[PDB]
C-alpha cells in the first residue's frame, strides 16, 4: 500500500504470537518494542535518541509479520514510548520513501 | 525520487541560506535540527522523544529546501542527536511511505 503522513504510521504486527501496534520509521536503524517477555537469549544494549538513551534488550532472527508481511531480524525490547519498526525490518516487507 | 533504506535516508536541505545534510524521519511529529543560527524569532519550547525530554527553540514558518523540494514551517532547533526532518514537512513535500 501507500501510507501518507498526515498522521503518524501505525501498523499492526504480530511478534512472539502478540499483535501490537507500531510506526514505520524510516528514521531508526533498529526495531525497537515495549517491554515484553519473548523466550530466548538476549544481549544487553543502549539506544539513543531525544532525551538520551534507554536501555534495551536485544534479541536477534525474530519473526514479525507486518501488514501481512513476513520478515525475521533484530528487535529491541526495552521502556520505550512507541514501538518503532526500523529500517533492519523495513527493507525486508519493501519499504520505500517517495515523493 | 524512490529512496530504499537499506542506508539512512539521508538528503541534503537548505535553510537560512545554509545546506545542511538532514534524516528523513517517518517517526518523527516535528522536524528537529542541531543547535545553529537561524535568522528569525522563536519561542522556547519543549519536545520528547525515546530518552526524555529536551528544549529545543521553535522557529515557525521557516523556508527550507529538502533534497529539491521547498516546504515552509516549523523548525525546532536544539540538542538532537541528529538532523531529522519529521512529519510536519514530509507532507509538505509529498512524501509518503510505499511497500
Ligand atoms: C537518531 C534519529 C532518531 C531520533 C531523532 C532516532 N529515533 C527514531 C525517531 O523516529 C523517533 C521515534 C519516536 C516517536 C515518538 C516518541 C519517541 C521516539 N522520533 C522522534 O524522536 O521524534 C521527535 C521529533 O517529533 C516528535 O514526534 C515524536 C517524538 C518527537 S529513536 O526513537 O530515538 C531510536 C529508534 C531505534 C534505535 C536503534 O537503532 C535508536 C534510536
Given at each position: 500500500?501507500?501510507?501518507?503522513?498526515?498522521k503518524?504510521?501505525?501498523?499492526?504486527?504480530?511478534?512472539?504470537?502478540?499483535?501490537?501496534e507500531?510506526?514505520l520509521?524510516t528514521?531508526?536503524?533498529?526495531?525497537?518494542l515495549?517491554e515484553?517477555?519473548?523466550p530466548?537469549?538476549?544481549?544487553?544494549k543502549?539506544?539513543g535518541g531525544?532525551?538520551?538513551?534507554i536501555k534495551?534488550?536485544?534479541?536477534?532472527?525474530?519473526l514479525?509479520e507486518?501488514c501481512?508481511?513476513?520478515?525475521i531480524?533484530?528487535?529491541l525490547?526495552?521502556?520505550?514510548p512507541?514501538?518503532?519498526?526500523?529500517?533492519?525490518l523495513?527493507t525486508?516487507?519493501?519499504?520505500t520513501?517517495?515523493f
Open positions: 500500500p501507500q501510507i501518507t503522513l498526515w503518524r504510521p501505525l501498523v499492526t504486527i504480530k511478534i512472539g504470537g502478540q499483535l501490537k507500531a510506526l520509521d528514521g531508526a536503524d533498529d526495531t525497537v515495549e515484553m517477555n519473548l530466548g537469549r538476549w544481549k544487553p543502549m539506544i531525544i532525551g538520551g538513551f534495551v534488550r536485544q534479541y536477534d532472527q525474530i514479525i507486518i501481512g508481511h513476513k520478515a531480524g533484530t528487535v525490547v526495552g521502556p520505550t512507541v514501538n518503532v519498526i526500523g529500517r533492519n523495513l525486508q516487507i519493501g519499504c520513501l517517495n
